[PDB]
A paper describes a structure:
The importance of the ubiquitin ligase murine double mutant 2 (MDM2) as a key negative regulator of the tumour suppressor protein p53 has been studied extensively. The RING domain of MDM2 has been discussed as an alternative target to stabilize p53.19 The rationale for this approach lies in MDM2′s ability to still bind and inhibit p53 when MDM2-mediated ubiquitination is abolished, thereby preventing uncontrolled activation of p53.8 The RING domain gains its E3 ligase activity through dimerization with either itself or the RING domain of its catalytic inactive homologue MDMX to form a homodimer or heterodimer, respectively. The dimeric RING domain arrangement is essential for E2~Ub binding and activation as demonstrated by co-crystal structures with UbcH5B–Ub (en dash indicates covalent complex).
The asymmetric unit contains two copies of dimeric MDM2f with each dimer bound to two molecules of UbcH5B–Ub. All UbcH5B–Ub molecules bind MDM2f in a similar manner as observed in the MDM2h-UbcH5B–Ub structure, where key interactions are fully conserved. Like in the crystal structures of free MDM2f, there was only little electron density for residues preceding the RING domain. The lack of 310-helices could explain the reduced UbcH5B–Ub binding affinity. Nonetheless, MDM2f binds UbcH5B–Ub in the closed conformation suggesting that it utilizes the same RING E3 mechanism to activate E2~Ub for catalysis. The 310-helices in MDM2h contribute to the stabilization of UbcH5B–Ub in the closed conformation and their absence in MDM2f and MDM2z might be responsible for the reduced binding affinity for UbcH5B–Ub.
Residue numbers in the entry:
A (entry chain AAA), B (entry chain DDD): 427 to 482
């Protein structure tokens, strides 16, 4: 299923905080949250980085 | 599908290199690769870090 935010792009934007990540959003939408200094939408941890994730 | 290495755990071990990640192994198997100084199994980039990834 697509990014829960835009419903258009795949869930390829891994929201990384320490050793864990929440993957529920696209890279574009996750980056927007990081750039706006917003926390992770599912766990409220501050975002360290967005990783463009490929499901090999 | 499960981790392509152990066939037991989920694909929750994101192999991070720069801004991208390859997600095909579990955290346990991916950590073994990083600890043994192995590159990413699909792209041969050095592994910067393993992120335990939850698919939401
Ligand atoms: Zn999106
Ligand atoms: Zn989170
Ligand atoms: Zn495994
Ligand atoms: Zn790779």
């Amino acid at each position: 299923e697509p990014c829960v935010i835009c419903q258009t792009r795949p869930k390829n934007g891994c929201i990384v905080h320490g050793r864990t990540g929440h993957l529920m959003a696209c890279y574009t939408c996750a980056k927007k949250l990081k750039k706006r200094n917003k926390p992770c939408p599912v766990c409220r941890e501050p975002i360290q980085m967005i990783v463009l994730t490929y499901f090999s």
